[PDB]
RNA sequence: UAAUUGCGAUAACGAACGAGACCUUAACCUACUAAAUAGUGGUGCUAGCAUUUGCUGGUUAUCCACUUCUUAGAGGGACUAUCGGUUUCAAGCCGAUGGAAGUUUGAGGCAAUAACAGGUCUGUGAUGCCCUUAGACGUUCUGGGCCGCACGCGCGCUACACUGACGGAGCCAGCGAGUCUAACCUUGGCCGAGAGGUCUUGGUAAUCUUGUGAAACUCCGUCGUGCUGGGGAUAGAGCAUUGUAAUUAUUGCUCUUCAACGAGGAAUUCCUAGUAAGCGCAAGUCAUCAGCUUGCGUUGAUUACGUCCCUGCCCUUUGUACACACC
C-alpha cells in the first residue's frame, strides 16, 4: 500500500507481510492419551486441529 | 456550425498554450490573518520558562 | 540395439511421423482443415494446405507418449502462441480446442491414443509399438 | 610512418575537467632510459603499452 | 569500504589489554576465545571484534 | 521445390474485378489489392479453386483465373463458412454477402447514410467527421482531415 | 517489384556459366548478380546442388554458404 | 467452520483488531491497557489488562 | 546394490540433479541422450566435461540427469555442472584421491563455473521504477 | 586418435577433434597471433573455447573485462540496439556463420582475421574536449590499449549493423564483409574510415 | 570511509542518540532433526523397443531402505581471511590465491535533533470554528455527466521491419491467489473456426487448478525490399461474454477496410552485473474492463570504476543593520 492517505508526494509504497507456519504430526494412539494430550499443551494463539482416521 | 470541419477553420484561443498562473506562492510564509496571538496567551497554554522551577 | 522415441531428436521424429500418416491415408481429417486458423492468436492459417494436421497429430502423439496423461486444455495452452493485440501489448492465448480435440479422436479411432483414467489421454500400447517403430526407422536414414 | 612503441612506467593522476584523461610516464622498448609523460584516453594500468604517433613531445595540464 | 566502528576497535583494545596470554594471531581460535571470555549478542559482531583483535595482535608482534 | 521454365505464357499485370493486379507477385497476396479481399479470404478461395499456391499471379491459366472470380462473389454456393464473410444477415433482405472491389465502397456509404437518414447518434457522429467508436477525443486525433 | 522474380530461360544458363569463380554463393549473393529475387534464389540453391557445382558448408534458414566444385 | 487457514489467521487478526478497539473506547476511564485472547475448546477467554479492575 | 553417487548443479534458479552409478556408460538427461539437448548452439557446452577429462572414464559408469526450474539457457549450465561434479564425486568415495584431484585440475584450469556453483541472482526491483536499478521517467515541469 | 564408444553414442566428428585439440566450433585457436604490438594481453586467444557463450563475471573488476575471449567480446557487442538486447543465441549463431563466411574468403583463420580486423581499426590517438573556457579546442591524447580494443569492437559492429539495415544482405554477411576489409584496411569499411579520421583530427591538433 | 566511519593532530579526556550494530530476504551445508501434502534408489505389479545382461514409460500405498535434489526448525560460515604491494608502513587502500560468498556480501526494513504555513477536513463516528439543515449543501430513486474536442503539456503502448514479420514445430520459470452458510481457482469428456457453450470432477490448498508446457527465445520452411506479407490507426458488417442495464459502441471472436509512421529538431529522462535493456507471468483494482502499478522469473550485453565541467546539495571561512531570520 502507498504510505500517504492522499496523493501528494513521491510514490512511496509499503509492503506489509504476515507469516503463517503450519505443522502437522502423525500419531497412533488410544482414546485416552489423545483426549489427554489435546486438552493441555494448549497455547494462546496457536491453532491446533485434531483430524480423525484415514479418510 | 457543427462538426470537425467548422472548428478546424477556427483560431485557437491563446489561453490554450498558457502557463500555470501561480497566484500566491511567494506570499506563503506571510500570515494574511492579521491576527498574531500574544505572549501571555501563549504562556497560558504552553507555560513560560521563567516559571519552570515551579513546574518541575 | 533397441529404440525409444527419446533417442530420436525432437523435430526430425515428427517430420517422419508426418510422412507416415500421410503415406497412410488412415487419418480422419475433419475436412474444415485449410479454412481454420488453429488459434485466435494467429494471423494466417497454416501454409501446409493439405497437411499439418499430420504434423500436429504426430506432435500430439509424441507429447502424450512422453507423459502420463494430457488433455485438450493442455494442448490449447501448449500449442498456443503469443497473439499481438495490435497497438495493445502481447499476451499468451490458448490455441483451438476443436483442432486439438479432433486430433485426439482422429488418432484414437486410428489407435495411437486411448482415453486415460484420472483425465486426459494415454498413449496406447500399440501407439508405443508403432511410434518406436518409425523412431528406429529414422536412425536407419542416418545408419 | 615512424611507429613509436612505449611502455607505461607509472600511473600519475587524473587530469582534464571531465577526468577522462590520466597522466602517465612511459618508456620506449627501442632505446630505453628516456622517459616521457603522455596523456591517455581510456582505462590504464601499469606495464601497459601505448602507441605514440610521434616520438618527442608532451603535454601536462588539461582544462 | 571496510572500516571497523568505534565499538569494535574499543572492545578490541580492552581485549588485548587484559589478555595478551592466550590470544594468538589466529582469528579462528581468538573467535572461540571470545565466546568464552566475552559477552556479545551476535555471531556477526563477535567475528568483527575477533578479526580486529587478531589484526592488532598481528602487528604487536613487530613493534 | 523445383526449377520452372515455361515459355512466353506468363504475363505481368493481368486485370480483373475492375482493378489491376501485379502478375509477378505471389497470387495468394496478389488478389488482396482488390477491395473486399484480404489475406485470409484470398487464401481460402485460391485453395478452393484447385490452384497451386506456389504459383504467381503471372501464372494461372485463364480458366483457373476466371474460376477464382466465381468463388469470390458466390462464396456460399461454393461452401464457405458464412461467418467468413464481411456482410452477413444484411440489414434488409437478411442475406449474407461478400461484397467486393468497387462495390464495397458503396456498401460503406449505404450503411453510413442509413444511420444518418435515421438520425441515430452513431450517424450524427460520422457526419461531424468524428471518432464514432466512443473513444476519448481530447488528446488523440489532431491532424486528421 | 523490380525485375528478378521470374524464370527467363536466358537467366537459367546465366546462372550455369556464372556460378564458377564464386568463392561465396548464397541467397543474397544471387540477388547481387542483377537477377534472382529471394524466392527463386532459395530454389536455385537446391537445384545447383542437384549435381555438383556447389558444396554446402553451411546449414540453414537466414544463412546459406556454398563453394566451387572440386 | 469451513475456512482457509489463510483467511482464518488474517480474519483472526481483525478480530483482535475490533476487540482491542471496543475496549479502548469503553474502559479508558478504568485505565485499560489492552487485551489477549486464549483459544481453547469449550471456551474463548478474553483477559482485560486494565489497571483498575474494581470498576470493570 | 552397486556403487553409485548422486550430485546436483544449479545455475540461476535452475537445479539439475544427476545420479552416477556403475554402468556400461550411457549418458542420458531427463529421458533423452546427451546427444540431443538443443538449445544446441550451446550443445558443446555440456559436452565439455566429457572432453577435458577425456572421452573414456565414463565406460564404467552410467550418467542420468533431470532438470527442473530455471529456463532454456539456465538449465544447460546446471546440467554440465552436475555432470562434472558427479564424475568427481565418483572418485571421492570410490576410485582414488590422486585421480580425483587430477580431475578438478583438468576442470578448473579451464572451467566455466564447473564444480563451482554460480552465485549470481536476480535483485529485487523496488518501487520508483520498472526495473531493479532502473527508475521511472521524470519530466520536471 | 583411439576412438572410444560406449552405450549412448558420441559421433565421429565429435569424438575426434574434441579430445585432440581444444579448438573452436571447428577452427584452430592455435596459430592466430596478434600481429601488432601492445594489443596483446588485451586480446585473448589461449585460453581456447568451443562456443562463444560464457557465464563468467567480468564486470566485478576493472581490467578483467580484457580476460574475456575476444571472439565472445565481439559477439556480446552484437546483441544490442533495443530489440536485440539479450539474444546471445541470436548473436553466437551469427558469429559462427560470420567465421564460416570469412573462412570462405582468402582462407586463413576466421578467428585470426578477427584479430587483424580489430588491431587495424583501433585509434592510436584521439582528441577529447578540453574547455579552456568559452570556445574549446581539441587536445590530442593517445588512446589506452584497453579502450583501443573496445572501441574497435563497437566500431566494427556498429558499421556492420548500419550496413545491414534495409538490405537483403544478412548480419553475418555484413559483419564478415566488414571484418574482411578491416583485416588489412582497405578504407572500404566503416571502421577503417572512422578510426583513421579520428587520427586525422588527432593530428590536426598537436 | 558510503558515514562526526575511523587514524592521526590535539586542553582535552573518556561517553550516549543517529550511522554501525540490529532485523528480514537472496546466496552456501552428502554434517544434526524429518516427511504419501516434497522426493530419490531398490523390489513387486506393469507396457514398448531390443534381445546377451539393456534402453524408455505406467502403477496416491504392493512393500523395503534413504534425505543428494524439495521443504524449515536448530546450528556452522566471513572476520574484507592468507600472502603481498602502497600509504604518517597509522586508519585504510589495491592486487593475487583460497573460498558459497570479499562492491556496507547483494537487496531491502528500521532510522536521531530540526525544519515546511508542503499534501490530506474528499479515509476516518479524528476534529475547532464557519455554513447549511425540510423548496436540505441530509438522504434516496430515475436519466445524464466525470469519456464532452479547433488546440498546448506529461506518463505510457505499439511501429517503422531481413538481429524481421509470418506458418509449422522444439519447449523452459518464479512471486502469487483460490468457494460457508457458498458460486472462488478450475483439470478432464463432449459441441463450436473462434469467442464460448454444456455434463461433470479435484481443491478451505506444498494434496486440485498447476510442471500454471508464460513470453522473449531455439529449429524447418514461406516471404525478398518494393509502405511489402513491416505497421495496425480508422471504419463497416456478424457472433459471443460480464452485468437489471453495454446506445456515447465494458471486454472477447470472425471477415473486410489497410491510415500515420522510412530512426525523429531544439530540448530531456534512466542506468554500472544477473545490473541495463528485451520478455512474459502473478498480485492489487475487479460483476465486466490494464496500454497502470506492485512483485516475480526468463534471456542477458556495450561502457565507467573516474573527475568537479554542467547541475544539485552539504562543509567550513567571511558579511550582516535579518532573528516572523531575504516570502
Ligand atoms: Mg508455447
Ligand atoms: Mg507454436
Ligand atoms: Mg484489402
Ligand atoms: Mg538437505
Ligand atoms: Mg578466486
Ligand atoms: Mg499552503
Ligand atoms: Mg484526513
Ligand atoms: Mg477523470
Ligand atoms: Mg515464430
Ligand atoms: Mg458453429
Ligand atoms: Mg502495406
Ligand atoms: Mg501484420
Ligand atoms: Mg533511433
Ligand atoms: Mg488483474
Ligand atoms: Mg491507477
Ligand atoms: Mg555573526
In this structure, the strands spanning G55-56 and G66-67 are antiparallel
* CA J78 distance to own-chain centroid: 10
Residues of C in contact with I35 (CB under 8 A): 9
Q: For chain H, which residues make up each domain, given as ranges? A: 7-56
Is residue A37 within 8 Å of A50, Cβ to Cβ? no
C-alpha cell at J158: 556498429
Resolution in A: 3.5
Kindly provide the residue ranges of all beta strands, DSSP E only, lying in chain I, ordered along the sequence: 4-9, 15-22, 27-29, 32-33, 61-68
Round to whole Å and give the CA distance between J102 and J106: 8
Residues of J in contact with G41 (CB under 8 A): none
CA of J161 to C1' of K85 (A): 45
Q: For chain C, which residues make up each domain, given as ranges? A: 1-143
Number of H helices, E strands in chain C: 5, 4
Round to whole Å and give the CA distance between F108 and F100: 12
Q: How close is the Cα of J110 to the center of ligand 8, in Å? A: 62
- Give the H/E segment covering residue J47: none
**Which chain A residue has the Cα nearest residue I129?**
A11
CA of H2 to C1' of K179 (A): 10
G63 touches chain J (CB under 8 A): yes
CA of D13 to C1' of K111 (A): 39
Residues facing residue A13 across a β-bridge: A2
> In a 3-state reduction of DSSP, which class is residue J86?
coil
Is residue J123 within 8 Å of J151, Cβ to Cβ? yes
Round to whole Å and give the CA distance between F44 and F49: 9
Is residue G7 within 8 Å of J137, Cβ to Cβ? no
Angle of the J171-183 helix axis to the J190-202 helix axis, nearest 10: 50
- For the CA atoms of F83, F88, F94, F98, the dihedral, rounded to the nearest 10 degrees, stands at -110
Q: For chain D, which residues make up each domain, given as ranges? A: 1-63
Is residue I108 within 8 Å of I115, Cβ to Cβ? yes
Distance from CA of A21 to the nearest CA of H (A): 10
Give the position of cell 544471387.
G30
3-state DSSP helix/strand/coil % of chain F, to nearest 5: 35, 5, 55
Give the position of cell 574549446.
J136
The full set of domains in chain E, from first to last, is 6-61 (1.10.60.20)
Residues of C in contact with F84 (CB under 8 A): 35
Round to whole Å and give the CA distance between D49 and I141: 49
The secondary structure of residue H27, as a DSSP letter, is G
> In a 3-state reduction of DSSP, which class is residue D8?
strand
Q: Which nucleotide's C1' sits nearest to the alpha carbon of J84? A: K163
Round to whole Å and give the CA distance between J115 and J33: 8
| F5 with G43: Cβ contact below 8 A | no
Round to whole Å and give the CA distance between J71 and J62: 19
Give the position of cell 476519448.
F136
Protein residue closest to K204, using CA and C1': H4
C-alpha cell at H3: 475456512
Kindly provide the residue ranges of all beta strands, DSSP E only, lying in chain C, ordered along the sequence: 82-85, 88-92, 113-115, 121-123
> In a 3-state reduction of DSSP, which class is residue D53?
coil
Its CATH class, for the domain covering H7-56, is alpha beta
The phi and psi torsions of B12 (rounded to 5 degrees) equal -85, 120
F82 touches chain C (CB under 8 A): no
Protein residue closest to K156, using CA and C1': I137
Q: How close is the Cα of G42 to the center of ligand 11, in Å? A: 24
C-alpha cell at J153: 569492437
* Method used to solve the structure: X-ray
**Residue ranges in J38-170 assigned as alpha helix (H):** 70-76, 88-104, 110-121, 145-163
Is residue G57 within 8 Å of J25, Cβ to Cβ? no
C-alpha cell at F89: 444477415
* Backbone torsion region of residue B22, taken as left when φ is above 0, otherwise alpha when ψ lies between -120 and 50, otherwise beta: left
Amino acid at each position: 500500500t502507498r504510505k500517504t492517505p492522499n496523493g501528494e508526494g513521491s510514490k512511496t509504497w509499503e509492503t506489509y507481510e504476515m507469516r503463517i507456519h503450519k505443522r502437522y504430526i502423525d500419531l497412533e494412539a488410544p482414546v485416552q492419551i489423545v483426549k489427554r494430550i489435546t486438552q493441555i499443551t494448549i497455547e494462546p494463539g496457536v491453532d491446533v486441529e485434531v483430524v480423525v482416521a484415514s479418510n | 456550425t457543427a462538426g470537425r470541419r467548422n472548428n478546424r477553420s477556427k483560431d485557437v484561443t491563446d489561453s490554450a498554450t498558457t502557463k500555470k498562473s501561480n497566484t500566491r506562492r511567494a506570499t506563503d510564509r506571510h500570515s494574511r490573518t492579521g491576527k498574531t496571538d500574544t505572549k501571555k496567551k501563549v504562556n497560558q497554554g504552553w507555560g513560560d520558562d521563567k516559571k519552570e522551577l515551579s513546574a518541575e | 540395439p533397441g529404440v525409444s522415441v527419446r533417442d530420436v531428436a525432437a523435430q526430425d521424429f515428427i517430420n517422419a511421423y508426418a510422412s507416415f500418416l500421410q503415406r497412410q491415408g488412415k487419418l480422419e481429417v475433419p475436412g474444415y482443415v485449410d479454412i481454420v486458423k488453429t488459434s485466435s492468436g494467429n494471423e494466417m492459417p497454416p501454409q501446409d494446405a493439405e497437411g499439418w494436421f499430420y504434423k500436429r497429430a504426430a506432435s500430439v502423439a509424441r507429447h502424450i507418449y512422453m507423459r502420463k496423461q494430457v488433455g485438450v486444455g493442455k494442448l490449447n495452452k501448449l500449442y498456443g502462441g503469443a497473439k499481438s493485440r495490435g497497438v495493445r501489448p502481447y499476451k499468451h492465448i490458448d490455441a483451438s480446442g476443436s483442432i486439438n480435440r479432433k486430433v485426439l479422436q482422429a488418432l484414437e479411432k486410428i489407435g495411437i491414443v486411448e482415453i486415460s483414467p484420472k483425465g486426459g489421454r494415454r498413449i496406447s500400447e500399440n501407439g508405443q509399438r508403432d511410434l518406436d517403430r518409425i523412431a528406429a526407422q529414422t536412425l536407419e536414414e542416418d545408419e | 610512418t615512424p611507429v613509436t612503441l612505449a611502455k607505461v612506467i607509472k600511473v600519475l593522476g587524473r587530469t582534464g575537467s571531465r577526468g577522462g584523461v590520466t597522466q602517465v610516464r612511459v618508456e620506449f622498448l627501442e632505446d630505453t632510459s628516456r622517459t616521457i609523460v603522455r596523456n591517455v584516453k581510456g582505462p590504464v594500468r601499469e606495464n601497459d603499452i601505448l602507441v605514440l604517433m610521434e616520438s618527442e613531445r608532451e603535454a601536462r595540464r588539461l582544462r | 569500504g571496510r572500516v571497523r566502528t568505534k565499538t569494535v576497535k574499543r572492545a578490541s583494545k580492552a581485549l588485548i589489554e587484559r589478555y595478551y596470554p592466550k590470544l594468538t594471531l589466529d582469528f579462528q581460535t581468538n573467535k572461540r576465545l571470545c565466546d568464552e571470555i566475552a559477552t556479545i549478542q551476535s555471531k556477526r559482531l563477535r567475528n568483527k571484534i575477533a578479526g580486529y583483535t587478531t589484526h592488532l595482535m598481528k602487528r604487536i608482534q613487530k613493534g | 521445390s523445383l526449377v520452372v521454365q515455361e515459355q512466353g505464357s506468363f504475363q505481368h499485370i493481368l486485370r480483373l474485378l475492375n482493378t489491376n493486379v501485379d502478375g509477378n507477385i505471389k497470387i495468394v497476396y496478389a488478389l488482396t489489392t482488390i477491395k473486399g479481399v484480404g489475406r485470409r479470404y484470398s487464401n481460402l478461395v485460391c485453395k478452393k479453386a484447385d490452384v497451386d499456391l506456389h504459383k504467381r499471379a503471372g501464372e494461372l491459366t485463364q480458366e483457373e483465373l476466371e474460376r477464382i472470380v466465381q468463388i469470390m462473389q458466390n462464396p456460399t454456393h461454393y461452401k464457405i463458412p458464412a461467418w467468413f464473410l464481411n456482410r452477413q444477415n444484411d440489414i434488409t433482405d437478411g442475406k449474407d454477402y461478400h461484397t467486393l472491389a468497387n462495390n464495397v465502397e458503396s456498401k460503406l456509404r449505404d450503411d453510413l447514410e442509413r444511420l444518418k437518414k435515421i438520425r441515430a447518434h452513431r450517424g450524427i457522429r460520422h457526419f461531424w467527421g468524428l471518432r464514432v467508436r466512443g473513444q476519448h477525443t481530447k488528446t488523440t486525433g489532431r491532424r486528421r482531415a | 517489384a523490380q525485375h528478378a522474380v521470374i524464370l527467363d530461360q536466358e537467366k537459367y544458363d546465366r546462372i550455369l556459366k556464372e556460378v564458377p569463380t564464386y568463392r561465396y554463393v548464397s541467397v543474397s549473393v544471387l540477388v547481387d548478380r542483377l537477377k534472382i529475387g529471394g524466392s527463386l534464389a532459395r530454389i536455385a540453391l537446391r537445384h545447383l546442388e542437384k549435381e555438383g557445382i556447389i558444396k554446402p558448408i553451411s546449414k540453414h534458414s537466414k544463412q546459406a554458404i556454398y563453394t566451387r566444385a572440386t | 467452520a469451513l475456512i482457509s487457514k489463510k483467511r482464518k489467521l488474517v480474519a483472526d487478526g481483525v478480530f483482535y483488531a475490533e476487540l482491542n478497539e471496543f475496549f479502548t473506547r469503553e474502559l479508558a476511564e478504568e485505565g485499560y491497557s489492552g487485551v489477549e485472547v486464549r483459544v481453547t475448546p469449550t471456551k474463548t477467554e478474553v483477559i482485560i489488562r486494565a489497571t483498575r479492575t474494581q470498576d470493570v | 546394490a552397486v556403487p553409485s553417487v548422486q550430485t546436483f548443479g544449479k545455475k540461476k534458479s535452475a537445479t539439475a540433479v544427476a545420479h552416477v552409478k556403475a554402468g556400461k556408460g550411457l549418458i542420458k538427461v531427463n529421458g533423452s541422450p546427451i546427444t540431443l539437448v538443443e538449445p544446441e548452439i550451446l550443445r558443446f557446452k555440456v559436452y565439455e566435461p566429457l572432453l577435458l577429462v577425456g572421452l573414456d572414464k565414463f565406460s564404467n559408469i552410467d550418467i542420468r540427469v533431470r532438470v527442473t526450474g530455471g529456463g532454456h539457457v539456465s538449465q544447460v549450465y546446471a546440467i554440465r555442472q552436475a555432470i562434472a561434479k558427479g564424475l568427481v564425486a565418483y572418485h571421492q568415495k570410490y576410485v582414488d584421491e590422486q585421480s580425483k584431484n587430477e580431475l578438478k585440475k583438468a576442470f578448473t584450469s579451464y572451467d566455466r563455473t564447473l564444480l563451482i556453483a554460480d552465485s549470481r541472482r536476480p535483485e529485487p526491483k523496488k518501487f520508483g521504477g520498472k526495473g531493479a536499478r532502473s527508475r521511472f521517467q521524470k519530466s520536471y515541469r | 586418435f583411439t576412438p572410444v564408444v560406449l552405450a549412448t553414442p558420441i559421433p565421429e566428428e565429435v569424438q575426434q577433434a574434441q579430445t585432440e585439440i581444444k579448438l573452436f566450433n571447428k577452427w584452430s585457436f592455435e596459430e592466430v597471433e596478434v600481429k601488432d604490438a601492445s594489443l596483446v594481453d588485451y586480446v585473448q586467444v589461449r585460453q581456447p573455447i568451443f562456443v562463444a557463450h560464457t557465464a563468467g563475471r567480468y564486470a566485478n573488476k576493472r581490467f578483467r573485462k580484457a580476460q574475456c575471449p575476444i571472439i565472445e567480446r565481439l559477439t556480446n557487442s552484437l546483441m544490442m540496439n533495443g530489440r536485440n538486447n539479450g539474444k546471445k543465441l541470436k548473436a553466437v549463431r551469427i558469429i559462427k556463420h560470420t567465421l564460416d563466411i570469412i573462412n570462405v574468403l582468402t582462407d586463413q583463420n576466421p578467428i585470426q582475421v578477427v584479430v587483424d580486423a580489430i588491431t587495424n581499426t583501433g585509434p592510436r590517438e584521439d582528441t577529447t574536449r578540453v574547455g579552456g573556457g568559452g570556445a574549446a579546442r581539441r587536445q590530442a591524447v593517445d588512446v589506452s590499449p584497453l579502450r583501443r580494443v573496445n572501441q574497435a569492437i563497437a566500431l566494427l559492429t556498429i558499421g556492420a549493423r548500419e550496413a545491414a539495415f534495409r538490405n537483403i544482405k544478412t548480419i553475418a554477411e555484413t559483419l564478415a564483409e566488414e571484418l574482411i576489409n578491416a583485416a588489412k584496411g582497405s578504407s572500404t569499411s566503416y571502421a577503417i574510415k572512422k578510426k583513421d579520421e579520428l587520427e586525422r583530427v588527432a593530428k590536426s591538433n598537436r
